[PDB]
Symmetry: D2
């Protein structure tokens, strides 16, 4: 179950379908953020193991992009189906490795990963090139070709959801991938590879591992492979507070979205704009809700918030929290670390903190990667747009309102890229993740053909 | 000169780039419905000129379909430029022959027609076949080809819009057209063909006039046409489908509709410009005398705002100005034919005696002077429940019926209670109500906080006993085309079994 | 369990609403295997009342299943395809037994194509997105894809399960509940497939009602409770169905049989290399499915001055076709789907003989000895005439191919196009310009170049002159089972100005 | 300074130009093409790309991805803003950007007539020959694979299985067969606004 260490020991690299040990023998320890207890040994590749990975990729490159789109899609579907029935194992691996809740892994990370695999198996079937009939004699054909080899550097935020988000398009398009998982949370990708890797031709899924300055730098700077987070407003208008029936409950539940996956999300809703005419009641219920979050051991059944990522995560979060506390950031809840006791002392927990202030303060124009939300207020829709667009960012935004004109005008006026409306943190496939990712890992072949013996 | 006559007294049959007198020698008189007078003689044709049109079309189809799509778009752009330079002549012709306000032809009709000829000349430039890689050895290439020769039966109520709603898709797609204008309004298409006759190559556009049993059936039952497009009455549509079910011919239709217009009490929340817009959108039944396929003639108003909405909407209806449609200012115009008055007056009688209390209007609109022989009915508002014939039969009159509901579920119930599925309008400020009403209404098109907008890029259609297809969109370019699927194999090695 | 053991059982009732319900009356007709004409079970005879039960269940599931998210329905379709792929042998044996098709042909092409078709349409469902149009700053039009509701389909018997899947995948991908009428020649294969997978779909999403094409085909087509009727079959029944479904305003989608040319240019035999073997393969492909293919290449057009070599080698390789028990893996051609069809091809052979066309091979029935005597086996027949004889202008659906010659490309186009059908065609040549010119010229919905009988999902397929309406096996089958909902939304509270 | 005031004008116009309907910008482009015809293989393609990109702008839709019964993702096609670039190239660039709703910053004589139509501030390889770099079967080669490993491109032949193989096997982006601009330009000067809207009141 979740309480048994999923990890095996001594994970080495995975190049060409076989577990290849480091060229220069080295193994850095796997420190689980949940407790800070060493849980495995991970290969430390420097510059040669990445070249073995590139060798396996360039050796399986020609036969994989030659595969049919239907056979490639069927391989992806088998990958997804074997990922499904092993849901608990991969979820437990990601929880142990990253400290995310076990509730948040069998509900939002794995099912999203499997659905991404199935989805990009489905977009490759429907994919088409294009014919342009220039005239009666000349025709232009546009085919989609794979890029070749692509190297992916997985972050530590979702080490399995984001890894699959970056793999599935690249494997659907027919490319061989060289992966370097981030050393903060390695070896959940090792577990996933040990689960699936034989389903792909040897050299399609290569996963080196090590340090960002050690392993990634030769990879990210390579003349072989063709290709290689801000403050998100959560505006609440006075509309949401007409009645206390079901949309205001949803509004509050969507306010407490900094505390899902410990705010390391790049689109963290860490800036909440509440209408002045509703601020008092909304913050009443919001403070009753944030303090109702159950912090504890991430891997039990129901811990809503777990360990962050590392020691550096805690130092950054604590530094930004203190800097906020200085300039006047009235704390409604939280505001420090959390020593939960038991085995949970070497961990890296931060408790959910509701800040309070104005967009001048540096907690609003600087991102924490932690469960720290910076509430503020605004007067009207125009001021809401003036404030919500005050940032050097825009990776996302969230608008809550019961008015059609308000929602559309906010969504179209906000300079974000993904505006949520009366929801937040829903990351479904086919919504831009979108079927246009397959074109990221594809080049185009243009053949212009003239069917006329004379000119 | 809008008040000056725009029609020659001898409109023959346009066939093969030239003016051809009918073989039967007969003719029929054209009546302007503004006054009831006579405005010219237009050729009466039968199954003999239908075949002349088909012969010209088939003699031009091979040369037309082989022209580049960039050559069939420059010609369309030149057609639109000519139609825009002469917007008043066409507006005046559509006014004299159809008897609708000159403002509605210089504002809606002609700009919409020019916009369609530009739009479908745009959609044609960006069109592209698909190439579906199957493996390294097999590739399927899909090409778009013209259907050949298409036959079109346009209706009267939009003489130059429904004619350009369907020529532009058909001429963009490389087909040659045999167009049959409705006998009730056969002159506007004639002036239009006069002014842009020489832009198209001979035989591509062939226009023949006549009645619906002598020049309509021969065109809509021929084996020389690839597709028959019809727009109008449902029974005539069944006639067309039966006639074209012998050569297995596509029969794209558009058959009326009884469109509701719902108000959810979110409009009466500030008495602001939005309430003003809702009031204006209520009276939209009077647009084109209510002889539009998407007529709001059913109105659903939330039970809490019925009193206020009526006490202002009756005022705005009583402010609708009627008169001679040919100067600058008439809002509600004249009916197309005398039989149109006859049907509408019979329907008004049925509504009066059924139990639909008359909020306003309810009789003819004798305007005196040189308008007594005209065809004018006063804009009318009744009030009943949905189980009454005025709610459940189309009128094409300046008539609307009003009933109320309790809540959104009842709104969907009543809005779907009819047998037609063409259109509907929704008026609310709440997003969830607007979406659930737009998606729950079993109609091909739903207007939310607007109505009677016909942009060239929004697919117009209905899915009930109201037709098959989608106008005003790039999907309609494919309705006049067919797919050639060339599945090439490149491996020169046998599969291994006979 | 085995290919040579019976794969059916007796009393296949109607599969209505995730159930097995008997007809309104105990009317039960009898299925009969073409391989050895004999009973292989007793099939329910469906009157109009069973169509009414099927439509009721389809409407209930239309209410519910309609709003099932595209990702859930695609998951159900993927699970259906996986279940079929893990039972490919059982389904293929059922198809061989009920249709007389060789087990070779089923296990090789027919069941893999059905599984690939379900996977393909689950995919194109996941990848399907509607449309938006920014009319101006204040008005947007939203084009939603919606289910049609309940659709009805009448499947032929030449490809019972393959056409059942070809029609079912887009229909249930699009959220449409289906009432499905199997051809009474081959009723019991769809039953086996249904009892296989009749637990992955919600009750009512798939309803299959088996009966005679006049007792049950008409009540299904003559119903206002279906948003569409789909048909594949003979042009007489196609015109009938067009009549019944035009009296109700419901759109129709036909796919009628065509007399498909198969042109062989004098370049196929230049170097008599493996490409020439492929061309002879393609010529012999007239006997695939025992000629019962709506796109059968039963009209071969060989260039005049290559005729000698091609016909000597091709008659050799057609005599080499091994006729035997279709349940043997070595058998290359099976039985005819019914005795009436065997009589039809025999009559057309006699017409061709009486019309002055020589017979190069075959020409009669065949008694394959043993229990196969009762079966309906026509010997692969080659005729030889010109384009004007009846057998060149009329459709046979038998292992019968008629051969003529052309002089140049223009005569090739004239002979290829001189017909009343445009369903399919085939063009064998090595010249690059010839293949494209001949594929563009030929009035055929599908044109195979340098191959033939390739039906890969995601390639469009339809009748081009008079042999049907619409396209199949492509992602735009989804649009044939969906309607567009336009929602024009104005975000400006400013009045229009007029009125 | 001069470029700075060009940028300031471009932003001031960008406030309003992006509000213009696709129909109206396409119509302005058609008027530009007409006016260029009046004052007319370089100008033909310039006019032709103005018409073509007006057409693609009229055709462009945007997606309405349906995630659930109660959740829809809308993919609008917002303009970027201000962008910066003989006359044929000038047009290949301006025609798409102006189509997308962008106030460009930059021919002179052409700019004199085109400028007034726009609102102010908006405008401111081997050559293989297969026997039936010049790779004649100038240099030479032996067989198909020979000229494949030697080697957008260009391929004269007639075998219909070497034209395809040699068109697909070349590591380039454009192969011309028996001889010797795209909607994807309009999506390069144009950004996507994804609006995920949830229509469920419950949670
Ligand atoms: K008239
Ligand atoms: K049978």
């Amino acid at each position: 179950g979740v309480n048994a260490l999923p990890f095996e020991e001594r994970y080495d690299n995975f190049i060409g379908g076989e577990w290849v040990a480091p060229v220069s023998g080295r193994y850095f320890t796997n420190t689980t953020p949940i407790t800070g207890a060493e849980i495995g040994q991970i290969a430390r590749s420097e510059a040669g193991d990445i070249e073995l990975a590139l060798d396996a990729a360039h050796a399986a490159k020609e036969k994989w992009g030659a595969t049919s789109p239907a056979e490639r899609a069927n391989i992806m579907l088998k990958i997804a189906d074997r990922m499904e029935r092993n849901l608990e194992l991969l979820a437990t691996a990601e929880t142990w490795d990253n400290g995310k809740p076990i509730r948040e892994t069998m509900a939002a990370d794995l099912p999203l990963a499997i659905d991404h695999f199935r989805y990009f198996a489905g977009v490759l079937r429907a994919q088409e090139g294009s014919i342009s009939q220039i005239d009666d004699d000349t025709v232009a054909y546009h085919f989609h070709e794979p890029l070749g080899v692509v190297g992916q550097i997985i972050p530590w935020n979702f080490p399995l959801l984001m890894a699959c988000w970056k793999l599935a398009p690249a494997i659907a398009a027919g490319n061989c991938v060289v992966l370097k998982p981030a050393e903060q949370t390695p070896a959940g990708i090792m577990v996933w590879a040990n689960l699936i890797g034989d389903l792909l031709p040897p050299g399609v899924l290569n996963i080196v591992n090590g340090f960002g300055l050690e392993a990634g730098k030769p990879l990210a700077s390579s003349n072989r492979i063709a290709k290689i987070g801000g403050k998100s407003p959560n505006i609440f208008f006075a509309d949401v507070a007409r009645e206390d029936d079901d949309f205001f409950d949803k509004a509050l539940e969507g306010f407490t979205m900094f505390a899902l996956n410990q705010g390391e999300v790049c689109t963290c809703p860490s800036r909440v704009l509440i209408q002045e005419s509703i601020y008092d009641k909304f913050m009443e219920r919001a403070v009753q809700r944030v303090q109702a979050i159950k912090q504890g051991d991430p891997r039990e059944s129901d811990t809503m918030i777990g360990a962050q990522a590392s020691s550096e995560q805690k130092e950054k979060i604590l530094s930004y929290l203190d800097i906020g506390k200085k300039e006047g950031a009235e704390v409604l809840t939280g505001g420090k670390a959390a020593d939960l006791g038991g085995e949970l002392s070497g961990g890296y927990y931060i408790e959910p903190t509701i800040f309070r202030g104005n967009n001048k303060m540096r907690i609003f124009q600087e991102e924490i990667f932690g469960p720290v939300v910076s509430v503020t207020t605004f007067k009207d829709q125009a001021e809401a747009l003036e404030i919500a667009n005050d940032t050097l960012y825009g990776l996302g935004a969230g608008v809550w309102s019961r008015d059609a004109n308000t929602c559309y005008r906010m969504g179209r006026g906000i300079k974000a890229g993904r505006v949520w409306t009366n929801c937040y943190h829903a990351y479904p496939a086919h919504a831009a993740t979108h079927k246009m990712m397959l074109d990221h890992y594809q080049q185009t072949k243009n053949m212009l053909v003239s069917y006329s013996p004379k000119k």
